[PDB]
């Protein structure tokens, strides 16, 4: 902080240590994604 030591009788502000720790916040994103079993069957199956 700034410090100004002035005046007579005026109560001066003693030198102030402001110490400050912020914090985080969490939000996950999620899409669901579907593939049918018959779609993945044709990857397996592979006929003539």
């Amino acid at each position: 902080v700034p410090r100004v030591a002035t005046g007579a009788g005026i109560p001066t502000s003693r030198q102030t240590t402001v110490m400050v720790s912020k914090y985080s916040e969490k939000s996950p994103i999620t899409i669901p994604f579907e593939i049918s079993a018959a779609c993945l069957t044709h990857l397996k199956e592979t006929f003539e």
Binding site: S36, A37, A38, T41, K44, E45, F47
Partner: protein, 289 residues
């Protein structure tokens, strides 16, 4: 040395619940060509069904099958559809009753009118067997009936729904939401005169999982039968009746898929309710009153 080097081999089979099912199916699909019936977490069974019972279920596919304890020793086990015992329940409109009484009834059935309406339902003749896929029309109908899981075409090509008829459904259709939806099956009696009543059947869907909170929403519906259930308790001393209602789990489906439909059969059509992604899952009987 020896011991721990062998146990690494039984440890490092990761990433699968066993890798015993999946790997050993492949070593028999390389052996025998691409094998069907192996990529199938659901569970089926093949059943010998006569030609006089072969109908409906044959044409439109994915529908309940029921066993009978018919009181006659020689044909003691007759297959019954969910369509079939609509000619027993009081819920079904008499046109809707006689629509399907004329489908089945062609000279190979109508004993089963006389030995279900006559030989009454004790709700222990019927057994929830399961749902169908892939009928085999030939000299003998041979129905692959699913037990636990979905009903579907082989090759995982199409989910076969559950064909619930309309009259058995809307009198205990549940509430409206978009969740998972359990299918229960409820037989309720109206104990009036004829020792069982006209044993009324219901396919009930509900979001409710728990037991007595589910029969409490039946305690809303069935006071007309419940007050008659109390009546024969004093209308007959010595003779008693049995259960009022009978609840059992039948399966579930995805509840955005609940939509009406129709089957296109002999003796006219029949308005049904089509429950698409129907995981068949039979539960135990809950006898209540």
């Amino acid at each position: 040395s020896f011991g721990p080097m062998k146990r690494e081999v039984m440890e490092f089979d990761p990433e699968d619940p066993y890798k015993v099912s999946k790997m050993r199916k492949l070593e028999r699909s390389i052996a025998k060509g691409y094998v069907y019936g192996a990529d199938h977490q659901a569970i089926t069974a093949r059943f010998f069904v006569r030609e006089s019972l072969g109908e409906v279920e044959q044409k439109n596919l994915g529908v309940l099958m029921f066993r009978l304890d018919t009181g006659i020793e020689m044909p003691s086990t007759v297959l019954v559809s969910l369509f079939f015992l609509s000619m027993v329940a009081e819920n079904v409109s008499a046109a809707t009753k006689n629509t399907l009484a004329a489908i089945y009834g062609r000279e190979g059935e109508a004993i089963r009118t006389w030995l279900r309406d006559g030989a009454w339902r004790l709700h222990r003749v019927v057994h929830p067997l399961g749902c169908t896929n892939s009928i085999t029309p030939g000299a003998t109908c041979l129905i692959t009936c699913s037990m636990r899981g979905h009903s579907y075409n082989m090759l995982k090509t199409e989910i076969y729904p559950l064909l619930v008829p309309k009259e058995i459904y809307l009198d205990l259709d549940g509430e409206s939401t978009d969740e998972i939806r359990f299918v229960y099956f409820v037989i309720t009696y109206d104990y009036n005169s004829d020792r069982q009543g006209r044993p009324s059947a219901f396919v009930v869907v509900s979001r409710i999982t728990h037991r007595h909170t589910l029969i409490n929403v039946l305690r809303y519906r069935f006071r007309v039968s419940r007050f008659h259930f109390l009546n024969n308790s004093i209308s007959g001393y010595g003779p008693s009746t049995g259960c009022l209602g009978t609840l059992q789990r039948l399966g579930w489906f995805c509840s955005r898929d609940s939509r009406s439909g129709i089957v296109a059969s002999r003796a006219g059509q029949l308005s049904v309710v089509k429950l698409e992604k129907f995981y068949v899952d039979v539960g135990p009987l809950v006898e209540f009153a």
